[PDB]
Design an enzyme around this catalytic site. Structure first.
Site, PDB file in Angstrom:
ATOM      1  N   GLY A 253     -66.639 -23.707  89.563  1.00 18.77           N
ATOM      2  CA  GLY A 253     -66.208 -24.986  89.204  1.00 18.77           C
ATOM      3  C   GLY A 253     -64.866 -25.330  89.774  1.00 18.77           C
TER       4      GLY A 253
ATOM      5  N   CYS B  28     -63.710 -24.609  92.863  1.00 20.99           N
ATOM      6  CA  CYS B  28     -63.867 -25.014  94.304  1.00 20.99           C
ATOM      7  C   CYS B  28     -62.982 -26.131  94.681  1.00 20.99           C
ATOM      8  CB  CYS B  28     -65.181 -24.969  95.104  1.00 20.99           C
ATOM      9  SG  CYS B  28     -65.866 -23.394  94.826  1.00 20.99           S
TER      10      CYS B  28
ATOM     11  N   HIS C 123     -69.042 -27.305 101.475  1.00 13.16           N
ATOM     12  CA  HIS C 123     -70.226 -26.919 100.853  1.00 13.16           C
ATOM     13  C   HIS C 123     -70.723 -27.433  99.560  1.00 13.16           C
ATOM     14  CE1 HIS C 123     -68.105 -24.749  97.231  1.00 13.16           C
ATOM     15  NE2 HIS C 123     -67.484 -24.158  98.197  1.00 13.16           N
TER      16      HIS C 123
HETATM   17  O1  LIG Z   1     -68.302 -18.351  95.642  1.00 13.88           O
HETATM   18  C1  LIG Z   1     -68.229 -19.495  95.099  1.00 13.88           C
HETATM   19  C2  LIG Z   1     -68.854 -20.689  95.778  1.00 13.88           C
HETATM   20  C3  LIG Z   1     -69.563 -20.489  97.194  1.00 13.88           C
HETATM   21  C4  LIG Z   1     -70.693 -19.540  97.253  1.00 13.88           C
HETATM   22  C5  LIG Z   1     -71.004 -19.157  98.445  1.00 13.88           C
HETATM   23  C6  LIG Z   1     -70.417 -19.569  99.622  1.00 13.88           C
HETATM   24  C7  LIG Z   1     -69.344 -20.670  99.624  1.00 13.88           C
HETATM   25 CL1  LIG Z   1     -68.275 -21.041 100.854  1.00 13.88          CL
HETATM   26  C8  LIG Z   1     -69.097 -21.001  98.145  1.00 13.88           C
HETATM   27  C9  LIG Z   1     -69.706 -21.418  94.513  1.00 13.88           C
HETATM   28  C10 LIG Z   1     -68.728 -21.278  93.411  1.00 13.88           C
HETATM   29  N1  LIG Z   1     -67.856 -19.880  94.060  1.00 13.88           N
HETATM   30  C11 LIG Z   1     -66.774 -19.544  92.956  1.00 13.88           C
HETATM   31  C12 LIG Z   1     -65.696 -19.644  93.244  1.00 13.88           C
HETATM   32  N2  LIG Z   1     -64.545 -18.998  92.503  1.00 13.88           N
HETATM   33  C13 LIG Z   1     -64.884 -18.465  91.527  1.00 13.88           C
HETATM   34  C14 LIG Z   1     -66.323 -17.962  90.996  1.00 13.88           C
HETATM   35  C15 LIG Z   1     -66.311 -17.170  90.068  1.00 13.88           C
HETATM   36  C16 LIG Z   1     -67.790 -16.987  89.651  1.00 13.88           C
HETATM   37  C17 LIG Z   1     -68.749 -17.514  90.402  1.00 13.88           C
HETATM   38  C18 LIG Z   1     -68.487 -18.264  91.382  1.00 13.88           C
HETATM   39  C19 LIG Z   1     -67.197 -18.669  91.822  1.00 13.88           C
END
Ligand SMILES: O=C1[C@@H](c2cccc(Cl)c2)CCN1c1cncc2ccccc12
Ligand SMILES: O=C1[C@@H](c2cccc(Cl)c2)CCN1c1cncc2ccccc12
Ligand SMILES: [Cl-]
Lengths: 302, 298
Positions: free
Chosen positions: A143, A145, A41
């Site tokens: 951040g 990921c 992603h």
């Molecule tokens: O869920 C995601 C990512 C995303 C979004 C949709 C689909 C995919 Cl595969 C990936 C983008 C960043 N993120 C986060 C990852 N962990 C913690 C977080 C905390 C607060 C905000 C975001 C966070």
């Protein structure tokens, strides 16, 4: 003596963390030999995340679109391929700090250490378990990921997890290092929900044996149970069924403490029925399920 | 989202762990520049008399599969300093710092100079640490990381009969009223680190857990009377000041969070949990909460 939630030393993984930038998106990558692994992603904008066609988005990219940073050194990307939900960026430098490693896919209940990173820099290390609903109860901000989960058994790092997303309940979903998600999750912004979570029964029993090894016996009782009667009770408290495999796995702890698995199961039934009554087990007022039978043996014996 | 007991990345400390073998005793040493620091009980007491009888070749120091040659030895309080011929190329930027009770640090548990685990601890008000150590873990170190600098604050020496641990700072000065010999020693009655509980209550609010919040406030005086009653450490104006940023971020004044803590102490949780815990957690300092809920890296 003592029992702590213990993570593996993160040094071997710290030397592998890099920052991967693609357009406006910046996340972490895992640099092993001449390949940087990261969530696919990174090639998306939040505007093309409901229904991304990763094959189509990837074909439009060139090697120079991916900016890889290892410390204060920019790595040069010489190739790129996608394996499931992971992007593999071939680089022109083999990581000299690459440890002996394997990519392992874990099963629910298994535990691992997480090296949480932001901008390719490690900020913390914690221990967690793959939940029965295939999510992890991590500690991740935007951040993070590409932060990885691992086990360091002997001198080999077994990479088992890469963080991809946070679900609406504050829990986390990711993939193994081959890009295959744990659970029925997909790397899209589509409505996704973690399934009903359950307690990892075999791990609770392992932790009850750890408490016995540490001199805590208050919860023990004179009763035993059949495996079926235990599962009929445990299921009512949202506990995972205990299989004959779990009973077999608990064998060494049963031998070391002299308490039969089904006898410890009867202690567990009682604890589920009564609660703790102001008492603690290993400094906890809740039944801990993030220590596997293998973790207990390692920490209590060596 | 999420809140975990998180340790600092241990890599900078892993490159410093060595095995120190003296006679029959084998424990861990901390190799920084050309000195290996380890508990002085490796020579076992009249430590001055036992040390004078030793020669440099009696101490076998092993860094991985390489034997380091000891060229000197001196004692500083309860730590033995073995001067070696080789300066550790992996020596990070470091300081030796003595921490105060309530402060937290990461412990890199080692056996035979090899790191086996890392966990986050707090120096208890009774100066013990509730660690997880087996025989062979002596010389395992506690540390914090500040930017790129490792602050060494603890070296493990022993386990007390209750299972809790005692050790020294890197200058060999014990935390607590403990001595490094086989004698009757007991950990004093412990108390809860109040400022850390409040910091962890702010972390729960930041994570969306608000059930324990109430409309009430209290005085620092009224609260400290309740803290005394429940074996909680007194909360000072310094603690209130330290909690300032979390109070600003959540809109819950420190004395407003204190009234929540007061109700939790007199009435309990009532089957509820805070951050997946049925107990009030006191091993996250106000800084740990800010660092984790904002994402500072090393
Ligand atoms: O869920 C995601 C990512 C995303 C979004 C949709 C689909 C995919 Cl595969 C990936 C983008 C960043 N993120 C986060 C990852 N962990 C913690 C977080 C905390 C607060 C905000 C975001 C966070
Ligand atoms: O307490 C000590 C050390 C000791 C002994 C006497 C006097 C002094 Cl100053 C120090 C020797 C090993 N050890 C242990 C240290 N940590 C954990 C342990 C767990 C189980 C058994 C032993 C352990
Ligand atoms: Cl597994």
């Amino acid at each position: 003596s003592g029992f702590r939630k213990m993570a593996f030393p993160s040094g071997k993984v710290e030397g592998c963390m890099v920052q991967v930038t693609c357009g406006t998106t910046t996340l972490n990558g895992l640099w092993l030999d001449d390949v940087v692994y990261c969530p696919r992603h990174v090639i998306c904008t939040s505007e093309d995340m409901l229904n991304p066609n990763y094959e189509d988005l990837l074909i439009r990219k060139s090697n120079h679109n991916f900016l890889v940073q290892a410390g204060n050194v920019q790595l040069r990307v010489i190739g790129h391929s996608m394996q499931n939900c992971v992007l593999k960026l071939k680089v022109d430098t083999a990581n000299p700090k690459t440890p002996k490693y394997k990519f392992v896919r874990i099963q629910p209940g298994q535990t691992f250490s997480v090296l949480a990173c932001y901008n390719g820099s490690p900020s913390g290390v914690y221990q967690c378990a793959m939940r029965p609903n295939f999510t992890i109860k991590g500690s991740f901000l935007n951040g993070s990921c590409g932060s990885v989960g691992f086990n360091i058994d002997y001198d080999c790092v077994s990479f088992c997890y890469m963080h991809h997303m946070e679900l609406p309940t504050g829990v986390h979903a990711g993939t193994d290092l081959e890009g295959n998600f744990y659970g029925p999750f997909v790397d899209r912004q589509t409505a996704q929900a973690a399934g009903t979570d359950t307690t990892i029964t075999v791990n609770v029993l392992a932790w009850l044996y750890a408490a016995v090894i540490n001199g805590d016996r208050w919860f023990l009782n004179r009763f035993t149970t059949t495996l079926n009667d235990f599962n009929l009770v445990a299921m009512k408290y949202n506990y995972e069924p205990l299989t004959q495999d779990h009973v077999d796995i608990l064998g060494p702890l049963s031998a070391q403490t002299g308490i039969a698995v089904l006898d410890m199961c009867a202690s567990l039934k009682e604890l589920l029925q009564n609660g703790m009554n102001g008492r603690t087990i290993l400094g906890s007022a809740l039944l801990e399920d993030e220590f596997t039978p293998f973790d207990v043996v390692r920490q209590c014996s060596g």
